[PDB]
Amino acid sequence: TTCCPSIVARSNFNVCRLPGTSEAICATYTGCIIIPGATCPGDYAN
């Protein structure tokens, strides 16, 4: 599951993904994170 710290971080994440970039690269690029579970924390609410 991906969790993002802000709205624009998510928007940027989704653009990064469009060419097929790995989630892990897009995470470090944007500040989003990948977790194994499905429950994002309150500080990665977007």
Side-chain angles (χ1 to χ4, degrees), residues 9 14 21 42:
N14 290 334
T21 313

Side-chain angles (χ1 to χ4, degrees), residues 3-16 26-27 29-33 44 46:
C3 314
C4 291
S6 69
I7 295 282
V8 84
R10 175 70 63 187
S11 301
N12 289 339
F13 187 90
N14 290 334
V15 168
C16 176
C26 293
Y29 188 46
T30 62
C32 302
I33 65 174
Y44 289 84
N46 302 129

